[PDB]
Design a protein around this nucleic acid. Structure first.
Ligand SMILES: Nc1nc2c(ncn2[C@H]2C[C@H](O)[C@@H](COP(=O)(O)OP(=O)(O)OP(=O)(O)O)O2)c(=O)[nH]1
Ligand SMILES: [Ca+2]
Ligand SMILES: [Mn+2]
Ligand SMILES: [Mn+2]
Length: 430
DNA sequence: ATTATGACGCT
DNA sequence: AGCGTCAT
């Protein structure tokens, strides 16, 4: 009733760049613009592996994790851009630098949480209060929301998509009470106005288009962002949650797309997010643990409390390379050469990071995979990172992993290594 | 023979 | 600390 918290305290947005690596390549090369196109890593094996796909190419069935040769079967005119290769490995610097461009624009509007290379959460609660006071009670014109969808609308009492979008927006705005500076629906609407402005600034100043979600928490904002892509934003109100969740497969909610979500489905015998409302908090905690149980109990009612952390920079800086099948490293010279290549890339990125961001990493994490292990990582070991020197870092990594070589021969490495990974962690201000 | 990351939870 | 999960 009156004391039942509804999770409507905050306004949170999620801004996600559309097909980001493709847009970076399309900015650089105009010949790729408005084309079916994809970004690939490497080329010799099956044409390279696709990691990003323009919406034109998606219409043909092209997807991430597809080999380029197979994508070309679906889309013979598909255009491809390759990730840069440096020191024998894919180098993603161009996309990291483009990401910094976008994140710095977003940070002008509010403090952001970098959630991935192409997305950030925004806590707009205070910006919304300021804009509401600057308003002084005039309604919000639909002209201020030119790319906004209102999830669940229109409803009740019409042939084109833009017309449907505008009908839903008109229903939403007509139902607004603009006199109540504490109305959550009004707060979300002002949040969407601000996100329109943020997205316009990103496109004006970078050329990049993005989508966004606006809701009361991170999970709903992320979910909202996905509802209308590309180049659109979606408002998910608290009131829209029962209908939205009533046919929402559990796996669509962030953190439930893996084993835990599969267990919710199997143990409870349900399919959709909304079905979770029928269980008590103690029932859910009994199946899924105290933390997960409380999280599920609140989240199936649209409520989630995870804060937008004030963090624009990555917490770790890492370098990794797989050595699949017959390219696995089987000699000491090979292992050392590749550790050096990874360490040289890491030194370059770290030195740039120190100059830009006034911090130094203090811990080096070395991870490997051995042939025959299905796990991502077969072994992780840390050591001290006291100098940004690639030769020292690669020698230290070799020292912490050399006990893995079960070969009696000094020169051979067995079982062969199918992955190397170096990660700099535990930053301190400098 | 998807690949290259990055965050966070558990014990 | 080292391992697992989730994201993609
Ligand atoms: N190296 C590498 N990069 C990846 C992988 N998956 C995604 N990326 C990169 C390429 C994408 O452009 C970028 C952002 O990922 P997203 O999941 O947001 O998709 P994207 O922006 O491409 O499309 P979207 O419009 O958001 O659906 O991350 C991967 O497995 N490996
Ligand atoms: Ca994206
Ligand atoms: Mn993303
Ligand atoms: Mn994607």
């Amino acid at each position: 009733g009156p004391h039942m918290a509804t999770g409507q305290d905050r306004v949170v947005a999620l801004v996600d760049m559309d097909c980001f690596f493709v847009q970076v390549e399309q900015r650089q090369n105009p010949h790729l613009r408005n084309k079916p196109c994809a970004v690939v890593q490497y080329k010799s094996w099956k044409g390279g592996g696709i990691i990003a796909v323009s919406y034109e190419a998606r219409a043909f069935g092209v997807t991430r994790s597809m080999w380029a040769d197979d994508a070309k079967k679906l889309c013979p005119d598909l255009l491809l851009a390759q990730v840069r290769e440096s020191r024998g490995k894919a180098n993603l610097t161009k996309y990291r630098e483009a990401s910094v461009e976008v994140m710095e624009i977003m940070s002008r509007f509010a403090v952001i949480e970098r959630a991935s290379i192409d997305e950030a959460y925004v806590d707009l609660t205070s910006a919304v209060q300021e804009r509401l006071q600057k308003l002084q009670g005039q309604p919000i014109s639909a002209d201020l929301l030119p790319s906004t969808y209102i999830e669940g609308l229109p409803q009740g009492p019409t042939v084109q998509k833009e017309g449907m979008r505008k009908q839903g927006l008109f229903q939403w705005l007509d139902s607004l009470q603009i006199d109540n500076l504490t109305s959550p629906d009004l707060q979300l609407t002002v949040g969407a106005v601000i996100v329109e402005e943020m997205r316009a600034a990103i496109e004006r100043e970078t050329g990049f288009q993005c989508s966004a979600g606006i809701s009361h928490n991170k999970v709903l904002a992320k979910l909202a962002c996905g509802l209308n892509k590309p180049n659109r934003q979606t408002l998910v109100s608290h009131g829209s949650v029962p209908q939205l969740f009533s046919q929402m497969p559990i796996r669509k909610i962030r953190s439930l797309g893996g084993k835990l979500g599969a267990s919710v489905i199997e143990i409870l015998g349900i399919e959709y997010m909304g079905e979770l409302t029928q269980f008590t908090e103690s029932q859910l905690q009994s199946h899924f643990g105290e933390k997960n149980g409380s999280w599920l109990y609140a989240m199936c009612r649209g409520i989630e409390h995870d804060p937008v952390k004030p963090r624009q920079l990555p917490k770790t800086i890492g370098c990794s390379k797989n050595f699949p099948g017959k390219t696995a490293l089987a000699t000491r010279e090979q292992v050392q050469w590749w550790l050096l290549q990874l360490a040289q890339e890491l030194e370059e990125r770290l030195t740039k990071d120190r100059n830009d961001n006034d911090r130094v990493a203090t811990q080096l994490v070395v991870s490997i995979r051995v042939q025959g292990d299905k796990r991502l990582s077969s072994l992780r070991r840390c050591c001290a990172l006291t100098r940004y020197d690639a030769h020292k870092m690669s020698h230290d990594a070799f020292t912490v992993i050399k006990n893995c070589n079960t070969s009696g021969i000094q020169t051979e490495w067995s079982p062969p290594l199918t992955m190397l990974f170096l990660c700099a962690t535990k930053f301190s201000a400098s």
